[PDB]
Write a protein that binds this ligand. Structure first.
Ligand SMILES: Nc1nc(=O)c2nc(CNc3ccc(C(=O)N[C@@H](CCC(=O)O)C(=O)O)cc3)cnc2[nH]1
Ligand SMILES: Nc1nc(=O)c2nc(CNc3ccc(C(=O)N[C@@H](CCC(=O)O)C(=O)O)cc3)cnc2[nH]1
Lengths: 163, 168
């Protein structure tokens, strides 16, 4: 489907933009707004194609802007986001309950279980430092509210040609 | 030098004990107290230092009564810190979003995550970190922190103050 493809291209483009220019990016933390386009992309296109949508959005991301370095497991992250967004959100009506438990399953399962894993995995980390976790946990706990408010709102301002 | 501070405080300590022992969720290694509401009132009423001692003793009568689960000091070290934090942010200064958040944040990080699991380390003996030994904890801290910024903020902006503020 073309129409779907145009949409996808633009959306992949926006995800790239968020991660691209307006994130807080430092060596062991990024603060971006890369959750918003991806949940719209989860809503329109559903789990598998939101998954692929965002995974390739990441790889386009690093092919363009590589200085950060490429680590495989981060693109798995992208994919999971898509699937999760899509699976919770495509396409039941947004419910505080479920903007909430999507958003939880994303924060606990990709942000504190896995991203610390990747860096640990191929950056040399003394995981043992649990003063390593303090910015990560300040953040992990501050932005969940932001994320939930924003997602709810976006969720509740026909989607397009998705599937 | 307190004639009524003692009586009313006794009453608040009692509220704390009930909220703590009678009314809230628990299992080994984790809990949701809803004692932040009365312990934050004491931040608001008593300034930091007494609120700290206030809830420290609220803990210890808490355990004079309600013996099983033993007594462990560093938990009452938590209790004094909670009191003192709510005391420092909420007494004599307006409670706004910008500061309910930074109190609830310092209690949460410094006590619920830096310190409490560190006492659970010594008593029950599981020192090591486990993905996901922690996790029910982290689930609880990240789901519930908004509940406290939305409950103590509203504690700070009320429902039917009437008589006299910030002295009583
Ligand atoms: N494939 C790949 N894509 C990337 O964009 C990438 N970027 C970096 C640059 N370094 C970083 C910096 C921060 C975080 C990080 O803390 N990520 C949080 C996201 C928080 C948010 O978006 O709000 C995470 O949990 O993943 C990861 C890698 C390194 N390898 C990569 N590898
Ligand atoms: N001194 C003392 N005070 C207590 O309140 C106490 N309570 C118990 C009962 N067992 C438990 C069970 C759970 C938690 C607990 O995890 N408390 C945490 C909840 C988690 C969090 O920090 O978010 C807390 O908030 O205090 C403490 C004691 C045993 N010894 C004590 N000893």
């Amino acid at each position: 489907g073309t129409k779907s493809i145009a949409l996808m291209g633009v959306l992949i483009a926006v995800v790239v933009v968020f991660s691209r220019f307006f994130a807080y990016e430092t060596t062991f933390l990024k603060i971006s707004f890369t959750f918003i386009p991806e949940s719209l992309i989860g809503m329109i296109f559903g789990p598998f194609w939101a998954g692929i949508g965002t995974a390739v959005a990441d790889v386009v991301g690093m092919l363009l802007f590589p200085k950060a370095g490429y680590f495989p497991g981060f693109t798995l992250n992208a994919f999971l986001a898509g699937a999760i967004y899509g699976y919770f959100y495509y396409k039941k009506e947004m419910t505080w309950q479920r903007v909430i438990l999507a958003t939880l399953l994303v924060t606990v399962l990709i942000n504190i279980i896995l991203t610390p894993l990747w860096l640990s995995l191929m950056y040399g980390v003394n995981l043992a430092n649990f003063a390593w976790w303090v910015p990560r946990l300040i953040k992990t706990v501050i932005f969940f509210p932001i994320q939930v408010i924003a997602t709810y709102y976006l969720g509740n301002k026909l989607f397009g040609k998705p599937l």
